[PDB]
């Protein structure tokens, strides 16, 4: 089959974490053992090309030739923490993987046949149409989840298959079933490379090669059965009823340089060195966008707790606000009530958008894994995520809010005013969400992002135009009002509502105001707040919000593009 | 030493999770093994009296007598997840435990000598004065943390010592060191009972007794060395290089009723049954309050990230608000600016108090463990926590806010007004924090509590008196304004500020107002909002806030008192 050989590998990150290491991994089960920080995982990443080539200082060859550019696309890699979509079924996950990884020339029938073959091979036919783990709906067993992860990487029929801790977190019987399946797959001529953690003898007997690493150094590389003999010849006795893997780890724990020199002075080292010296996008943009959006939307529907909670909160807020403000009046209290309700609606659209920091943070590991494997470009992933999760969920609350409250309150009864209000609330929601994405994209934890979002929104709320009267602020500070998302929305809503209204019953101030301090019309109130009375004074707010949306989405895209994905 | 015997135990919770189980545990290492859900942990809790006596249906005797009332006080219990205070040192944790568990008649010198003995026995003299694990400061190793947990339970010199998974989460060498220490302690005549998870042969050889449980049933009880012989006589062969514990678990996994009957039909069962048939506050309230408050305050100082973040946010908000509102004026815009800034200060005191849901949630497991062990009463714990964490941290922001903004803004320049403002902001902070405690006390997770707090505060903010004008609300809804914490604070601040002010330059409306709609004095503004002009109209707000504080703190105390602590 395929023979992976690594010669004189050195990896430095500038500390060195992988010293001189060399070996050969042939078809069959090849295992890597050692302490948690020893370097089994680092070696696995280096051999899989999942690491930046800066630190690499060695030679890797497959069948005696250097690794080609499309190596990551032609070799499967199974991650330790499963990244299968829980809200989908086994066949759905396999269909997504097959759609994005296999060439599009193949018909849908051929892809379905290949998926059928893979399902049969891994023995998933019982659960072929079951949701794989929801945490709101019960899912299949952990062994079936791991088998699904293996199946997604087997769709493209790889020659080399990497696994990272394929047994950690599983039960003993499940672990044995997993490794027996791996053993069956290895006999077919498939090269399987994996790292394990504290195996058992039942597990240990199945290997064909063993590579022991500790503190970045090669303690032993050779056939698995001969490790015990090597360590006995080193001068260590094996007690009965003792697991050999536990024996090797006990030897390592208790020096390391001594065992390293001993291995170099061994015959296996000479044979390996002699052999080493002897040897020396698939799919379109639209296709990826469609499938990314489809999977994201299915995940949104299948895990609806958060979305339902947001919609219920929106409806309850709408009904309560409609009851509290029912029947606005054109008297001394009309200005206060109108300004208060519009201010609340705008700042609510801002504060309820801080949950958009979780759009890209929750799926970061899945994104990096699938980008490395060549599923899609960053552009199509970004646009599909925006089109499926951001677009409808930030659009529904605006429609619900206006439809509920507009006629309970008795806002301006024209159709243009109704639709301008709905559109303005939508634009505020999109701008706030885009700012949250720009701040949070490409990060692993949301705590600092959430704190920054909340502080920024509190400062923007103060500059909206209700709490401080923007015309009174000092000039060296006043320019900060142009960075306020709520200010543009609040200004547009006030312009839409207050124009042409009277608030002093019995007193007609449209012609002239008799007393100088009365504030009897909507125009007087708007000008006192610093708001322009022309139609451009309405629409420049929407121009500003649109420009903010574009800028923030571009920043989020760039932060995803230049993210270190390794 | 002390002999713990359990006869015909049945535990039902009404599913039964512990079927007929009986045995005897003598001095030396006694271990309990089995699957995760098998019942090793349930048996350990039942034998330690850490479970409600409702489900218990058996007999437990120590040296042939029933367990006395003060059994939990005289027997140490080491929890799986360590509960040692990270911000303290080893000697500090031991001093706290010794102060609350040993009788107060002993001098401080005797307690210090006992702590010295315990430190020597566990070999912690190297790290006797080091912070035990901070997550903001590097701490001692996991083995030393576990040894500290064991030391806290050894202060009172117990005869019986329970441990729950004393090796889970540790390294192999650390696990061996821990169990060797346990073996040394057991030879001194101390009865040690513990449950383990997948031990090694090096671990397994150290036991003196073994009790195997699976699916609530007793698979085997007898000397540890004879388990292999029993299972061989059952008809199961042991392969070489196999850990016996893994062998027993493999037997169990593969029926259970068959092995249960086999064990009943064994000679060990007969011997155990024959033996069983043969057999059949320390400190004052003030002391506890002082020490609880001392430890809580040290923990607050030693882990200051959150407190520093809150103070920095407060100072930045204060300076920015002072700059934005600098120099309030007595003109048409004076009313809007004064009302806006006071509204922001009050609602900020409410929203920044939702982080008080973490006062009792974070330390729930520590509270339950220490309450069961008889460290303190719930009253002294509750009061010490209030006196150390709630009292100063909710007092600082009010002082900082008033001191910074009062003279930048130019609020009323009397001393009484300054101190009334400071006191009012303090009362708002305490009321909001008390409501958060009442909602969150006695719970494990804060998500639902945080959601309820935020929704309640948003509804209270709408009823404060700026966004809706309380005199205009319909009668069947208007009564809801009496539940609003921000409303009382905002009313008091407005009463304090607006009385005696003019806002129409050139127009003297103190005598009479020439035009009917002008709003030229602070009295007119206050009456339009529904606020009483008498001095009682100021102080009834503080009466309401004080009553709310008392009611909410009483609810929080009751929820801690009737919490199921088992």
């Amino acid at each position, epitope marked *: 089959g395929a023979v992976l050989s690594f010669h004189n590998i050195c990896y430095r990150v500038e500390k060195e974490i992988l010293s001189n290491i060399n070996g050969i991994m042939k078809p069959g089960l090849n295992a890597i053992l050692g302490p948690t920080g020893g370097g089994k995982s680092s070696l696995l990443d280096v051999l899989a090309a999942r690491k930046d080539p800066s630190g690499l200082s060695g030679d890797v060859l497959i069948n005696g030739a250097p690794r080609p550019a499309n190596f990551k696309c032609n070799s499967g890699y199974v991650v330790q923490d499963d990244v299968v979509m829980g809200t989908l079924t086994v066949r759905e996950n396999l269909q997504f993987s097959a759609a994005l990884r296999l060439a599009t020339t193949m018909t849908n029938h051929e892809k379905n046949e290949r998926i059928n073959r893979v399902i049969q091979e891994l023995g998933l036919d019982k659960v072929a149409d079951s949701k794989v783990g929801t945490q709101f709906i019960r899912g299949v067993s952990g062994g079936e989840r791991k088998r699904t992860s293996i199946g997604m990487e087997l769709i493209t029929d790889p020659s080399i298959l990497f696994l990272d801790e394929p047994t950690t977190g599983l039960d003993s019987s499940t672990a044995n079933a997993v490794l027996l399946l791996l053993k069956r797959m290895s006999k077919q001529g498939r090269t399987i490379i994996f790292s394990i953690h504290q195996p058992r003898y039942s597990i240990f007997k199945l290997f064909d090669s063993l590579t022991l690493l500790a503190s970045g150094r090669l303690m032993f590389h050779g056939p698995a059965q001969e490790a015990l003999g090597y360590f006995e010849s080193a001068g260590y006795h094996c007690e009965a009823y003792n697991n050999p893997a536990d024996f090797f780890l006990d030897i390592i724990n208790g020096l390391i340089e001594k065992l390293a020199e001993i291995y170099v002075n061994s015959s296996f080292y000479k044979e390996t060195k002699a052999e080493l010296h002897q040897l020396s996008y698939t799919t379109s943009f639209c296709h990826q966008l469609r499938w990314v959006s489809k999977r994201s939307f299915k995940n949104l529907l299948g895990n609806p707790q958060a979305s339902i909670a947001q919609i219920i909160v929106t409806v309850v807020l709408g009904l309560v606000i409609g009851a509290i403000y029912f029947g606005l009046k054109n008297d001394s209290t009309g200005i206060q009530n109108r300004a208060g309700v519009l201010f609340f609606l705008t700042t609510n659209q801002c504060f309820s958008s801080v949950s958009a920091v979780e759009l890209f943070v929750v799926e970061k590991k899945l994104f990096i894994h699938e980008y490395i494997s060549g599923y899609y470009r960053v552009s199509s992933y970004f646009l599909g995520k925006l089109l499926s999760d951001l677009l409808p969920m930030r659009m529904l609350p605006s429609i619900i809010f206006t439809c509920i409250v507009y006629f309970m309150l008795g806002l301006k009864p024209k159709a243009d005013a109704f639709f301008v209000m709905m559109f303005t609330l939508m634009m505020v929601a999109y701008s706030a969400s885009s700012m949250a994405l720009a701040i949070a994209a490409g990060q692993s934890v949301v705590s600092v992002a959430t704190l920054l979002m909340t502080i920024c929104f509190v400062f923007m709320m103060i500059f909206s135009g209700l709490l401080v009267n923007l015309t009174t602020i000092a000039s060296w500070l006043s320019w900060l009002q142009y960075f306020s998302i709520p200010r543009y929305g609040f200004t547009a809503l006030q312009h839409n509502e207050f124009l042409g209204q009277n608030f002093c019953p*019995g007193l007609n101030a449209t012609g002239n105001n008799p007393c100088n301090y009365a504030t009897c019309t909507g125009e007087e109130y708007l000008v006192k707040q610093g708001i322009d009375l022309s139609p451009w004074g309405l629409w420049k707010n929407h121009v500003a919000l649109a420009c903010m949306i574009v800028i923030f989405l571009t920043i989020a895209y760039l932060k995803l593009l230049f993210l270190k994905k390794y | 030493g002390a002999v713990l015997s359990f006869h015909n135990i049945c535990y039902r919770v009404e599913k039964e999770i512990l079927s007929n189980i009986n045995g005897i545990m003598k001095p030396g290492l006694n271990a309990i093994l089995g699957p995760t859900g098998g019942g090793k942990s349930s048996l350990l809790d039942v034998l330690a009296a850490r479970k409600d006596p409702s489900g218990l249906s058996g007999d437990v005797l120590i040296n042939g007598a029933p367990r006395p009332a003060n059994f939990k006080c005289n027997s140490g219990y080491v929890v799986q997840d360590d509960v040692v205070m990270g911000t303290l040192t080893v000697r500090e944790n031991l001093q706290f435990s010794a102060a609350l568990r040993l009788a107060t008649t002993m001098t401080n010198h005797e307690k210090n000598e006992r702590i010295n003995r315990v430190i020597q026995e566990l070999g912690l003299d190297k790290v006797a004065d080091s912070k035990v694990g901070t997550q903001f400061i590097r701490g001692v190793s996991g083995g030393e943390r576990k040894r500290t947990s064991i030391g806290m339970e050894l202060i009172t010199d117990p005869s019986i010592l329970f441990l729950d998974e004393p090796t889970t989460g540790l390294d192999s060498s650390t696990a061996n060191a821990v169990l060797l220490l346990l073996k040394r302690m057991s030879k001194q005549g101390r009865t040690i009972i513990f449950s383990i998870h997948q031990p090694r042969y090096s671990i397994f050889k150290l036991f003196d007794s073994l009790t195997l449980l699976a699916s609530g049933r007793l698979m085997f009880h007898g000397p540890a060395q004879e388990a292999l012989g029993y299972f061989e006589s059952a008809g199961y062969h042991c392969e070489a290089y196999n850990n016996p514990a893994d062998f027993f678990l493999d037997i169990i996994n593969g029926l259970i009723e068959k092995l249960a009957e086999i064990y009943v039909n064994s000679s060990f069962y007969k011997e155990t049954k024959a033996e069983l048939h043969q057999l059949s506050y320390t400190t004052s309230f003030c002391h506890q309050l002082r020490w609880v408050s001392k430890r809580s305050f040290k923990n607050l100082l030693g882990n200051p990230q959150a407190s520093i973040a809150q103070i920095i946010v407060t100072v930045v908000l204060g300076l920015v608000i002072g700059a934005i509102y600098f120099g309030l004026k007595n003109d048409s815009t004076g009313i809007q600016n004064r009302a806006g800034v006071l509204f922001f200060l009050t609602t900020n005191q409410c929203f920044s108090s939702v982080s008080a849901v973490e006062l009792f949630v974070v330390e729930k497991k520590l509270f339950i463990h220490e309450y069961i062990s008889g460290y303190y009463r719930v009253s002294s714990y509750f009061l010490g926590k209030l006196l150390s964490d709630l009292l100063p941290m909710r007092m600082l922001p009010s002082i900082i806010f008033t001191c910074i903004v009062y003279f930048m803004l130019g609020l009323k320049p009397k001393a009484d007004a300054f101190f009334v403002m400071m006191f009012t902001l303090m009362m708002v902070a305490y009321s909001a924090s008390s409501m958060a405690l009442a909602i969150a006390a006695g719970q494990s997770v804060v998500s639902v509590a945080t959601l309820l707090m935020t929704i309640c505060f948003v509804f209270m903010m709408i009823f404060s008196g700026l966004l809706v004008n309380l005199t205009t609300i319909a009668s069947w809804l208007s009564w809801l304004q009496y539940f609003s914490i921000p409303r009382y604070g905002f009313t008091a601040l407005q009463h304090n500020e607006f009385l005696g002010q003019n806002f129409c330059p050139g127009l003297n409306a103190t005598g009479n107002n020439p035009c009917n709609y002008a709003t030229c004095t602070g009295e007119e503004y206050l009456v339009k909002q529904g606020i009483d002009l008498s001095p009682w109209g100021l102080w009834k707000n503080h009466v309401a806030l004080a009553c709310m504080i008392v009611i909410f703190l009483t609810i929080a105390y009751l929820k801690l008192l009737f919490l199921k602590k088992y």
Partner: antibody, heavy 118, light 107 residues
Framework: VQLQESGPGLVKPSQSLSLTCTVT?????????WNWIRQFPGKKLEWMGY???????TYNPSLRGRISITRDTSKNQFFLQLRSVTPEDTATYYC????????????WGQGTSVTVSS | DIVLTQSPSSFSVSLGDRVTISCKAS??????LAWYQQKPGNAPRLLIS???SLETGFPSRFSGTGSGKDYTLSISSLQTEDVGTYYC?????????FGGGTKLEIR
């Protein structure tokens, strides 16, 4: 500036009462608010409602749904309709004017008596 | 709503005497108070607005004072043309309410 009520002086119970005020010397669409006030026997005054110069209305809450005030700007008139009447609605009815910059009821009508009997 | 209470429902006086009529509001009114005089067979006639300002067409014998919740109408040297009924009215809040009225009488 000059107001005058008119309408039927007798109403049967459960019927509807209708009155008219004709304004001369000022345009009801120009400035003020235009009110209806009644005085019971055993003299006590009750304000009922007004119609504003721009057509908005405001009513006394003690007359829920029973009162409507409308206007006819071509002939400078505003109207009162009080429906489902009872003998407790026996009173003298006045129309009056309210400025608003001042706040008081400056000009009154003559008053018309309405009896609700059978 | 705001309830207005006049203390005496009736008041007996003689010519040239001094009369004082009192009105109490249940809430703060802030000088938004008016006084009306009604003769028998006529509509009420505005006498004082703003609690102090006297209307043109009335003698300076009438004056009004007050603040807060208590207001008074004062007549110095009562004459024959001053006999009638007097009402206070608040126009601070939108359900405008009248007082019960005080009927002056001659002894």
């Amino acid at each position: 500036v000059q107001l005058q009520e008119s309408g039927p002086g007798l109403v049967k119970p459960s019927q509807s009462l209708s009155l008219t005020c004709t304004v001369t010397g000022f345009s009801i669409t120009s400035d003020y608010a235009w009110n209806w006030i009644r005085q019971f026997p055993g003299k006590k005054l009750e304000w009922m409602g007004y119609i504003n110069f721009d057509g908005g209305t405001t009513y006394n809450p003690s007359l829920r749904g029973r009162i409507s005030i409308t206007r006819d700007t071509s002939k400078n008139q505003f109207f009162l309709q009080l429906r489902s009447v009872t003998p407790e609605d026996t009173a003298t009815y006045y129309c009056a004017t309210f400025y608003g910059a001042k706040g008081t009821l400056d000009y009154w009508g003559q008053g018309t008596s309405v009896t609700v009997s059978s | 709503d705001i309830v207005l209470t006049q203390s005496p429902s009736s008041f007996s006086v003689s010519l040239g005497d001094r009369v004082t009529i009192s009105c109490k509001a249940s809430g703060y009114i802030l000088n938004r108070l008016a006084w009306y005089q009604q003769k028998p067979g006529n509509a009420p006639r505005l006498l004082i607005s703003g609690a102090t300002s006297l209307e043109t067409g009335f003698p300076s014998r009438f004056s009004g004072t007050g603040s807060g919740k208590d207001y008074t109408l004062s007549i110095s040297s009562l004459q024959t043309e001053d006999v009638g009924t007097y009402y206070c009215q608040q126009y601070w809040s939108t359900p405008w309410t009248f007082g019960g009225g005080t009927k002056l009488e001659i002894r």
